[PDB]
Design an enzyme around this catalytic site. Structure first.
Site, short mmCIF file in Angstrom:
data_model
loop_
_atom_site.label_atom_id
_atom_site.label_comp_id
_atom_site.label_asym_id
_atom_site.label_seq_id
_atom_site.Cartn_x
_atom_site.Cartn_y
_atom_site.Cartn_z
CD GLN B 1 -2.69 1.42 0.17
OE1 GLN B 1 -3.10 0.19 -0.29
NE2 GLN B 1 -3.33 2.36 -0.36
CB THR F 1 -2.58 3.01 -3.73
OG1 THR F 1 -2.97 3.80 -3.05
CG2 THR F 1 -1.50 1.68 -3.22
CD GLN F 2 0.62 3.80 -9.47
OE1 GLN F 2 1.32 3.38 -7.84
NE2 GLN F 2 0.97 4.64 -9.97
CG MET F 107 -4.11 9.11 -2.12
SD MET F 107 -2.57 9.12 -0.60
CE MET F 107 -3.01 7.74 -0.05
#
Ligand SMILES: *[C@@](C)(CO)[C@](*)(O)[C@H](Cc1ccccc1)NC(=O)[C@H](Cc1c[nH]c2ccccc12)NC(=O)[C@@H](C)NC(=O)CN1CCOCC1
Ligand SMILES: *[C@@](C)(CO)[C@](*)(O)[C@H](Cc1ccccc1)NC(=O)[C@H](Cc1c[nH]c2ccccc12)NC(=O)[C@@H](C)NC(=O)CN1CCOCC1
Ligand SMILES: [Mg+2]
Ligand SMILES: [Mg+2]
Ligand SMILES: [Mg+2]
Ligand SMILES: [Mg+2]
Lengths: 226, 222, 195, 211, 204, 233, 196, 195, 196
Positions: B1, F1-2, F107
């Site tokens: 994450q 997010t990755q 994000m």
């Protein structure tokens, strides 16, 4: 921590920094990470500080008893084998990462040992948070057929790299040289490049500054006669 | 994450004099156990005799300072080149911080300068916008190391007058700029010794009616 | 269980303990006595996890009674409190610890002094002029800090105790069904039947 | 924190501590937890400092705008409700605020409790913060409507002291206010360290503590 | 939840010229609630002083344990234990509980009765020794104490000067920690006299 | 997010008396698989700037396109595009830094660590770092990933502070960089022997060296090492 | 790690790389993964270094004690001791071992012991993280009854490719030849095998 | 909040609602009126999550008052209850549902009949002779099942209500600080000041 | 899945197996993984079948629309459209695509587009779960400017090994030859390639 081990012509040398930490705080500015297992077998530890000491004292104690039993001077392979079998049994819960080095009737030896019980052989090694900073120096300058003076320089240069570039390492450089056919020389505070400068002011207080409620004499002596 | 926050370490310190103020901070920038830079300025002259430092997550710190410097510029455009008073700057910064109440600037901010009566002023902020004027404030990594020292050596806390035995306090005599800088230097030298994220260099910005002056001092590089 | 209070006055120790016992959403009993006499001049009140409390208290009672018979002598409140602390400190690192908090009120016949000890389930012992466990102290300690003197009579101690219970009854969300009050002095242990 | 406020014959008393914490670290020794919204309105602060300052200073803006539109001071009831409605917009978004809106209006003295959930309660006496339980103990046993201004100021001051002593997250100093029909009146900053020893001697309380 | 910060407390020790000092706060709490203002954290076994911070049950337990062990040492050896030796005993005793440790931060202080050399030492909860020349700190305000000691301390202080330094380091560190305070005690230790002083501090 | 898929490892750099040097290997790793062996991770922007990128290669190729587009856009209605109003290293960096911080604030970060190396109009050396978090810093030496841990210590021995920069020549600086790249090949499991090196000098301009190899490697001592402790044969 | 053992006309050859990693850091670039449990019975180790060293040490102890009582053990017997340890302690171990040895009766033999603790006798065996990349190459190029020189080339070429694609593999190529003639150690450096 | 009761007798509807409001471990108020007059002959009591209750009740009150002014006519209790149900049924599938349970007591002036409706936060409506929300019914419904007649007077309804509160006060672990009782009949809404 | 594309003298050849699995069950043993996005621009698909089909359909739409406006698109242009979809929707996709096409100007070209959505132009490319087992074989046996027959044998041998070791691969070997001459489909059955 930063620790190193370097082999040379007629022996082996180990070195360490002198900083211990509780997280980001420095607990001890002049810690001693070079531990003695036997007179000519010294190890240097990283990881859980109590574990590196306790495991060193335990194996050193059993090595001394073994040396007395066999009427022989202790070997590094014995300390190595006793350490790894002990650490393996506790499956890494004893967080001791050590560089073990010494001289014995077989010759000069240099090993590393990890908390789970794996061992390695080398001419030059490095452990701890500053291992990468130190190893960069070792890979740059190490060569075959080093002299004693060249090896101490290389080892202390590798520790300095850790001191300056790793936040987990600092203060001073300790060294121990183990040469064949000689007594081992422990060089406590071989280098001292981090002396605190003079403070600008003295914070010595006037006598009577602190408020007091009660005073009393403490009886530390035993019960008296008559 | 993905973690959008980080910790670049550092420590800052602001002290308000009678007719001056100082804002100091170390020049070391770090991630984890590595050093990024030994000299990366952290305390900035924002104009109008105001200095500022946003300590913590450097990306958010640079963004906040950049936005406040911009706020000063637009305050001049919108209000006829009026000087932004330190109290007004403080309230403005509160609103900059709270605009991200639900995705905060991860920084402990301090500004310093002079109030409208010419007296020394220091304002201290939390990451979400609560602020208050103070005499003395250390922020960042070694804040907990330094503040107690300043309570003792600036406000004379727990210090009484000899002979009286706790009946009469040590009187709160004012400090000169030379005396304050000594306390600042000792504070950072002490913090450098016991905190791994503090070191390399110390940069102090001093604010008087004459303007903003800089002083630099080396710190231990280990 | 919930509320247990203690106060040490001039010549006695007074313990107050709630009467309620709850199981699920129902109050099964409103007259439960959360205390055991360890010796003629030592009383222990208790509060904690269901079942564990009485088992621990009775276990302590048995051990002190055994000592009393063996030596034909009453242990001092201090000695009893230390024994109790050790059992709890031993317990906390066991496979399944006993989750019990206690107050030990005793009158030392040797020193002619009342004594109150507060011990939690971890084995944390403290001698106090007044004490409590759980949330009870949050409401009551301010009143005790204000009104308490060491030269108070037993009657004055009961009046200050009434004031503490009244405050609990006003500000707690919990109905603990009043308290059973017991006095420990030179003449032994007696219960205040009207409170 | 510890805050309290109560109505009585001569208006309303307001008392707060001044401590601020960041974990176990005491971040501030002296933080102001009262806001002077107008000469007849006060607001206490407990919870997230940022939330308390932002929303109560926004309430003041909205209370000030009320005066300009209507040519008349806002009621305590209406001010408290505006604040509770603000809290209801950010419902479940993580705001942490507990406040008492204290003032004097046409109905006489007014006191309302308001928190981040939107709860809005009228009452004679309130106390918020980590040390509210300790303050309630002193208040409930010593409160009367027939209190004198002098005795009432002391009660609120003494109640904060009780909490500052026992609660680890309350202390620093005591800020006192007295709200009358001519407006609120500040009754100073009182260091707990000095106040404790003074009260101990004069009152005879805190016998267990040595000094 | 964190055992090392439930009850709260601090200990600090300092070396001087032919003397040592050790000090502690008197607070014992249940998190936010203050319970006792008389909970002293410094004990002595002969002329060796031991300060213990952390979980109060373990503090009490360890005192009783080291009293036990030092009393047997003395019966067999026919002499009082020395600081250097006692330090090793503490380290040994703590590490034997490596995987179920006492949640404490002990501090040893004393003067070797033979050499006359001042001695202090600190430990982590599992036994690692920190033999410092200057000072040792322990407790919930350890960071605060490190900052005060590192700036206020200077070597070779006289007993009555050392007293003021250690007292001010403790007091001002305690006043920046919510879990420390409620009184304080300072021991001033010389080769054959020990003075104990209770300090006046804010009770919040 | 990755999460990063195809990655590039360390980028290392340093200042010297007349300019800056930057270097990075030609590998595109796919986890532990050394998948792609012909990947250029140093991207020149004009004749005064080289951007070195580590981290996710797909995001690198995206940034590479943003820069190519930036040059195109700067030339629009700009007669001084190849002179006074040409792109500066400081302009290119601040643009990237703005993009990186914006992407982390949404994000959805560009999973990279970037070093912008160049020489300004006034001859001043430019060397600044930026990453997926938008964090920026400048130093006489800069390195990403493993380079930060192993290269910086070696490069800092040549230029430890600002005052060492004028004392350092291009031959010394290049030698230090080349040695650092050898050390990384010894010790970084996600590195390759083949690499690219770029020098931006205020006098001689931009020199871009391709198909460089790590040479003068020490392996002979390995023959003597036997077992893991007690084994002799 | 990249390890293999190959039978041929005159006996058997073991081969391995020399890289040991802790994540992406190379903790040791000159590791000796070819370990001797008896005079002419060697093994290649993969998985946890702590586990495989502990196992091989115990096996070396068992075969030393076997020899003292019953004479030279078979390669099959050695593989059985490895198996018995790997199988019974499979919940607490991460070890993938290849056993290789020479008898005058049975000549060269190869046994592989993967994670679960099963045993498989083979003409040749490959294991380690880098083995995945050479399943196709080795299957296509392996022949039975190769010469020593042919077998050395086969192992060299095979591990060359494993090293080329696997980041967890690298360094030098070590080999151990097991024949009637004796025990020959070989080493091949990057400059030799990289240009294949 | 916690306990809200309702009972429909011969000629009226009686609603009883607890006075306690709690925040943390402290009872902030012991005189809270958990009810809103929707119209002269319709009363709604409520219980649920903090803040949501009053906001919902006042929102309903505003809508019914708006209707009353627009039409110059009082909606029947049945119509009001259906409006309330729909708002809750609409709410339960919203991003953030309103966690409120209500009792609607009204006197229908057209039919000359008292009416009691029970609606939970999901929008579950039922007309009942007596009702409750949460755990209140677990203690009280057995008494109501036994003693309730449809021809009861208002006085008899209050006596049966006292018996329900006494049972709650005995068997609940919760101190709800008594109840405010309100009667809804042909003459409107009035509060019983002594209960 | 086992897929590859190889450039040679006269153009380019795509190759693939025909197995589609749902866990261990073979849902389809005669899948056609060679998909046409333009006359002489084809792709090999790996990853989620739903994702790769949806992508290739969209790409086929874009290139059909491109052709109507601007004429025959380049193989590079096709790879760019694939990339733009794979890169911008990387959070919601699992697609590993190899693009291959023939121009008369640029001749045969091969582009590979792995998971992240990066693009890499190569002489030849391999992908799919089975590719891991032939990295070594393909690297050793690939030459530039091979003949058609040499290239067919190379792909046949390579996929033969991938199928042999990968359980997720199997069935028939399909191939598509892209040259100036036109488009030739080939097929090779188990009885042919298994005995190689
Ligand atoms: C560097 C300083 C790395 O930080 C060295 O390796 C150093 C080694 C060393 C050896 C002998 C004496 C002094 C220092 N290691 C430490 O200083 C070490 C850091 C540390 C702490 N916990 C660790 C866990 C795993 C690896 C390293 C760890 N210090 C200690 O272990 C001391 C200070 N003990 C503690 O901090 C005790 N902690 C145990 C768990 O509960 C919190 C306290
Ligand atoms: C008690 C002290 C509770 O701890 C009070 O409620 C107090 C209330 C208050 C209100 C206005 C101004 C000052 C204080 N609250 C705090 O101090 C509060 C406690 C806290 C910390 N994190 C929290 C999260 C959720 C709820 C409460 C929390 N502290 C803060 O808000 C901290 C983060 N703020 C400061 O310390 C403010 N700093 C501003 C710059 O100067 C130093 C202090
Ligand atoms: Mg360092
Ligand atoms: Mg307090
Ligand atoms: Mg219902
Ligand atoms: Mg198959």
């Amino acid at each position: 921590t930063t620790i190193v081990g370097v082999k040379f012509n007629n022996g082996v040398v180990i070195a360490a920094d002198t900083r211990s930490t509780q997280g980001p705080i420095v607990a001890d500015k002049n810690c001693a990470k070079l531990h003695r297992i036997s007179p000519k077998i010294w190890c240097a530890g990283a990881g859980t500080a109590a574990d590196t000491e306790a495991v060193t004292q335990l194996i050193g104690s059993n090595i001394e008893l073994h040396s007395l039993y066999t009427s022989r001077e202790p070997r590094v392979v014995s300390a190595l084998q006793m350490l790894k079998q002990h650490l393996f049994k506790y499956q890494g819960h004893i967080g001791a990462y050590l560089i073990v080095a010494g001289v014995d009737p077989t010759g000069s030896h240099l090993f590393s040992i990890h908390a789970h019980g794996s061992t390695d052989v080398g001419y030059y090694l490095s452990l701890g948070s500053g291992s990468l900073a130190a190893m960069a120096v070792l890979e740059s300058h190490w060569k075959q057929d080093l002299t004693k003076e060249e090896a101490i320089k290389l080892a202390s240069d590798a520790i300095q790299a850790g001191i300056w570039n790793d936040l987990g390492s600092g203060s001073n450089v300790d060294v121990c040289v183990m040469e064949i056919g000689k007594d081992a020389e422990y060089l406590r505070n071989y280098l001292t490049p981090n002396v605190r400068e003079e403070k600008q002011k003295s914070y010595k207080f006037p006598r009577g500054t602190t408020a007091v409620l009660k005073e009393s004499i403490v009886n530390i002596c035993d019960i008296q006669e008559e | 994450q993905f973690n959008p926050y980080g910790d670049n370490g550092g420590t800052i310190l602001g002290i308000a004099g009678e007719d001056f103020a100082v804002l100091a901070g170390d020049t070391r920038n770090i991630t984890d156990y590595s050093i990024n830079s030994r000299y990366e300025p952290k305390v900035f002259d924002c104009g109008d005799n105001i200095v500022m430092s946003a300590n913590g997550f450097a990306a958010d710190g640079d963004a906040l300072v950049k936005r406040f410097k911009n706020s000063v510029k637009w305050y001049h455009f919108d209000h006829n080149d009026k000087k932004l008073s330190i109290n007004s700057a403080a309230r403005n910064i509160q609103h900059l911080l709270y605009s991200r109440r639900f995705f905060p600037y991860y920084v402990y901010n301090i500004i310093a300068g002079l109030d409208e009566d010419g007296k020394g002023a220091v304002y201290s902020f939390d990451p979400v916008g609560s602020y208050q004027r103070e005499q003395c404030r250390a922020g960042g990594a070694a804040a907990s190391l330094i503040m107690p020292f300043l309570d003792n050596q600036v406000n004379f806390k727990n210090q009484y007058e000899p002979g009286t035995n706790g009946k009469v306090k040590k009187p709160l005599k004012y400090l000169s700029v030379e005396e304050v800088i000594k306390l600042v230097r000792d504070s950072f030298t002490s913090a450098t010794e016991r905190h791994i994220q503090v070191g390399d260099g110390l940069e102090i910005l001093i604010v008087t009616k004459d303007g903003v002056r800089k002083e630099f001092y080396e710190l231990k590089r280990d | 269980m919930d509320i247990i209070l203690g106060i040490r006055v001039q010549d006695s120790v007074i313990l107050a303990s709630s009467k309620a016992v709850t199981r699920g959403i129902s109050v099964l009993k409103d007259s439960d006595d959360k205390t055991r006499q360890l010796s003629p001049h030592t009383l222990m009140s208790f509060a904690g996890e269901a079942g564990d409390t009485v088992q621990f208290a009775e276990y302590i009672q048995a051990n002190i009674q055994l000592y009393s018979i063996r030596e034909d002598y009453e242990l001092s409140p201090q000695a009893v409190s230390s024994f109790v602390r050790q059992e709890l400190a031993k317990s906390i690192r066991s496979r399944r610890p006993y989750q019990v908090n206690v107050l030990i009120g005793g009158y030392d016949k040797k020193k002619n002094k009342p004594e109150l000890y507060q011990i939690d389930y971890l084995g944390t012992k403290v001698e106090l002029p007044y004490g409590a466990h759980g949330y009870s102290g949050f409401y009551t300690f301010s009143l005790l800090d204000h009104h308490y003197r060491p030269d108070m009579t037993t009657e004055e101690g009961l009046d200050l105790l009434k004031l503490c219970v009244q405050e609990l009854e006003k500000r707690m969300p919990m109905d603990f069904k009043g308290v059973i009050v017991k006095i420990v002095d030179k003449d032994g242990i007696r219960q205040v039947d009207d409170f | 924190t510890t805050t309290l406020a109560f109505k009585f014959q001569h208006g309303v008393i307001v008392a707060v501590d001044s401590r601020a914490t960041a974990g176990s670290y005491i971040s501030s020794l002296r933080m102001n937890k009262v806001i002077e919204i107008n000469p007849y309105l006060l607001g206490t602060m407990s919870g997230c400092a940022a939330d308390c300052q932002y929303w109560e200073r926004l309430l003041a803006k909205e209370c000030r705008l009320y005066y300009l539109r209507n040519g008349e001071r806002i009621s305590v009831s209406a001010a408290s409700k505006l604040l509770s409605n603000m809290m209801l917009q950010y419902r479940g978004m993580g705001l942490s605020m507990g406040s008492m809106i204290c003032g004097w209006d046409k109905k006489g003295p007014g006191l309302y409790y308001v928190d981040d959930n939107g709860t809005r309660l009228s009452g004679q006496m309130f106390s918020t913060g980590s040390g509210n339980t300790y303050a309630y103990g002193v208040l409930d046993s010593n409160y009367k409507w027939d209190l004198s201004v002098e005795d009432a100021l002391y009660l609120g001051k003494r109640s904060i002291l009780a909490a500052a002593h026992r609660d680890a997250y309350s202390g620093g100093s005591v800020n006192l206010y007295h709200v009358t029909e001519d407006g609120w009146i500040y009754h100073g900053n009182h260091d707990v360290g000095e106040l404790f020893w003074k009260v101990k001697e004069e009152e005879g309380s805190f016998n267990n503590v040595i000094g | 939840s964190d055992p090392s910060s439930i009850n709260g407390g601090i200990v600090v020790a300092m070396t001087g010229k032919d003397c040592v000092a050790i000090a502690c706060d008197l607070r014992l709490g249940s998190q936010s609630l203050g319970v006792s203002n008389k909970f002293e954290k410094i004990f002595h076994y002969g002329h060796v002083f031991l300060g213990i911070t952390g979980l109060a049950t373990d503090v009490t337990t360890l005192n009783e344990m080291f009293r036990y062990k030092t009393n047997l040492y003395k019966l067999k050896e026919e002499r009082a234990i020395e600081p250097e030796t006692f330090t090793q005993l503490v380290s040994s005793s703590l590490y034997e509980r490596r995987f179920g440790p006492y949640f404490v931060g002990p501090v040893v202080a004393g003067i070797n009765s033979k050499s006359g050399k001042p001695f202090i030492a600190g430990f982590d909860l599992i036994g690692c020794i920190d033999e410092a020349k200057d000072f040792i700190v322990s407790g919930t305000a350890s960071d605060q104490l490190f900052g005060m000691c590192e700036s206020l301390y200077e070597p070779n202080l006289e007993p009555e000067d050392l007293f003021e330094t250690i007292s001010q380091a403790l007091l001002n560190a305690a006043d920046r920690d919510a879990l420390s305070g409620w009184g304080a005690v300072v021991y001033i230790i010389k080769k054959d006299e020990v003075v104990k002083r209770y300090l006046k501090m804010r009770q919040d | 997010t990755q999460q990063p898929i195809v990655t590039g490892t360390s980028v290392i750099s340093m200042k010297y008396d007349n300019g800056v040097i930057i270097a990075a290997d030609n590998l595109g790793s796919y986890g532990s698989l050394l998948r792609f062996n012909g990947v250029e991770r140093l991207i020149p922007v004009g004749d005064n700037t080289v951007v070195g990128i580590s981290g996710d290669i797909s995001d690198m190729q995206h940034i590479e396109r943003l820069l190519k587009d930036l040059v195109t856009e700067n030339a629009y209605d700009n007669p001084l595009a190849d002179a006074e109003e040409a792109l500066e290293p400081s302009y290119i960096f601040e643009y990237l830094a703005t993009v990186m911080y914006q992407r982390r604030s949404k994000m959805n970060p560009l999973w990279n660590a970037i070093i912008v190396a160049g020489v300004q109009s006034n001859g001043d050396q430019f060397l600044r770092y930026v990453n997926l978090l938008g964090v920026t810093y400048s130093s006489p030496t800069l390195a990403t990933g493993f380079g930060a841990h192993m290269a910086n210590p070696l490069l800092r021995k040549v230029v430890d502070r600002e005052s060492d920069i004028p004392k350092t020549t291009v031959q010394v600086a290049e030698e230090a960089i080349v040695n650092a790249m050898r050390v990384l090949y010894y010790r970084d499991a996600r590195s390759s022997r083949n690499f690219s090196l770029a020098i931006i000098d205020k006098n001689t301009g931009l020199t871009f060296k391709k198909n460089l190899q790590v040479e003068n490697m020490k392996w002979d001592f390995a023959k003597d090492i036997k077992g893991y402790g007690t084994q002799k044969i | 790690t990249s390890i293999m053992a190959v039978t041929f006309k005159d006996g058997v050859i073991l081969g391995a790389d020399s890289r040991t990693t802790t994540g992406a850091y190379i903790a040791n670039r000159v590791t000796d993964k070819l370990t001797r449990v008896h005079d002419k019975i060697w093994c290649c180790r993969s998985g946890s270094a702590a586990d495989t060293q502990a196992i091989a040490d115990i096996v070396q102890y068992h075969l030393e004690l076997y020899t003292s009582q019953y004479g030279t053990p078979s390669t099959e017997t050695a593989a059985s001791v490895f198996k018995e340890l790997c199988y019974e302690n499979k919940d607490n171990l991460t070890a993938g071992i290849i056993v290789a040895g020479y008898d005058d009766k049975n000549k060269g033999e190869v046994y592989t012991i993967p994670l679960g603790g099963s045993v498989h006798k083979l003409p040749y065996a490959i294991a380690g993280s880098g083995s995945t990349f050479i399943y196709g190459y080795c299957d296509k190029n392996f022949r039975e009854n190769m010469s020593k020189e042919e077998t050395v080339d086969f192992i060299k070429h095979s591990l060359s490719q494993a090293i080329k694609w696997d980041g967890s593999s690298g360094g030098v190529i070590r080999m151990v030849v097991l024949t009637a003639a004796g025990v020959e150690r070989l080493i091949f450096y990057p400059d030799e095998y990289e240009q294949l």
